């Protein structure tokens, strides 16, 4: 942490502090608490728990000068979200990035689950409508293509109210266009990689949602940049 604070306070930078398994922090805590002599608390956890976690977390924010944003990885105690350890942490969390072992198989990297990953700053108050409106939409359409999955495996692609198709069309293009050319993937791939801004990103799904792409083959939106890179990826398919 202390190493991170430096470049903020001293150099005005916006740093990123990654803490892999911040659970071990509060865990190791209780372990000792017993040798110190503190009285056991809810589930054996050190009675100081909440407070220890606070003085740790509150140190991570954006002062006048710089800022520190942190990515923590949380191992919940046997997929139980009511344990003191996780509970206490969530109370500091401003957003959640879920990586699903499903999206990767389907070749959608990053493997971030487009439904499960939430964010506090996903409100029109903090992004305005066009991001929000687009965002919540891109999810909804994805929910349809999800629920329908059952039926697809029942009625084939023959009947779905001839709308449900239009969704499954856009849905794929959309959850496919949710991949990307990663700078740290050039090593084994060769594709240079991309930094698509929020603005450019919102515009792309905007249009994909307006269906103005519904004629480009799936695999075109699959692992690219801005909406234009899907175009060139496309004529590369052979489309006018």
């Amino acid at each position: 942490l202390t190493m991170a604070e430096y470049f903020r306070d001293e150099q005005g930078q916006d740093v990123l502090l990654f803490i892999d398994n911040i659970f071990r922090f509060t865990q190791a805590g209780s372990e000792v608490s017993a040798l110190l002599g503190r009285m056991p608390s809810a589930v054996g956890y050190q009675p100081t728990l909440a407070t220890e976690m606070g003085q740790l977390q509150e140190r991570i924010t954006s002062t006048a000068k710089g800022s520190i944003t942190s990515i923590q990885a949380i191992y919940v105690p046997a997929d139980d979200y009511t344990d003191p350890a996780p509970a206490t942490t969530f109370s500091h969390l401003d957003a959640t990035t879920n990586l699903e072992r499903k999206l990767a198989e389907m070749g959608i990297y990053p493997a971030v689950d487009p439904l499960a990953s939430t964010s506090r700053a996903l409100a029109p108050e903090i992004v305005g409508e066009e991001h929000y409106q687009v965002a919540r939409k891109v999810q909804q359409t994805l929910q349809r293509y999800k629920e329908l999955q059952d039926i697809i495996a029942i009625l084939g692609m023959d009947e779905l109210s001839d709308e449900d198709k239009l969704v499954v069309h856009r849905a794929r293009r959309i959850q496919f266009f949710l991949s990307q050319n990663f700078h740290v993937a050039e090593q084994f791939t060769g594709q240079p990689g991309s930094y698509v801004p929020v603005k450019e990103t919102v515009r792309g799904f905007k249009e994909i949602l307006e269906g103005k792409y519904d004629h480009l083959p799936e695999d075109a939106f699959r692992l690219v940049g801005r909406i234009e890179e899907v175009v060139e990826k496309a004529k590369a398919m052979g489309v006018e």
Partner: protein
């Protein structure tokens, strides 16, 4: 044809106020045919239902009872 002095009953397997042409009642016997087969929904809801009924039973709504 039931012809009674005060009434005339016309039994019909299929009857539709239709034009001079007959090759309509067939038309109605048409646009109604597959549009009755299109009633797969009848079938498919029950699928989704027989589905749910076997997904709430999946968790073996009783594990060795309990």
């Amino acid at each position: 044809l039931e012809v009674r002095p005060d009434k005339v009953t016309i039994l019909a397997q299929a009857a539709e106020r239709a034009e001079d042409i007959d090759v309509l009642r067939a038309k109605a016997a048409k646009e109604r045919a597959e549009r009755r087969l299109q009633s797969q929904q009848d079938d498919i809801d029950f699928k989704r239902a027989e589905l749910a009924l076997k997904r709430a039973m999946n968790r073996l709504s009783v594990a060795e009872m309990k």
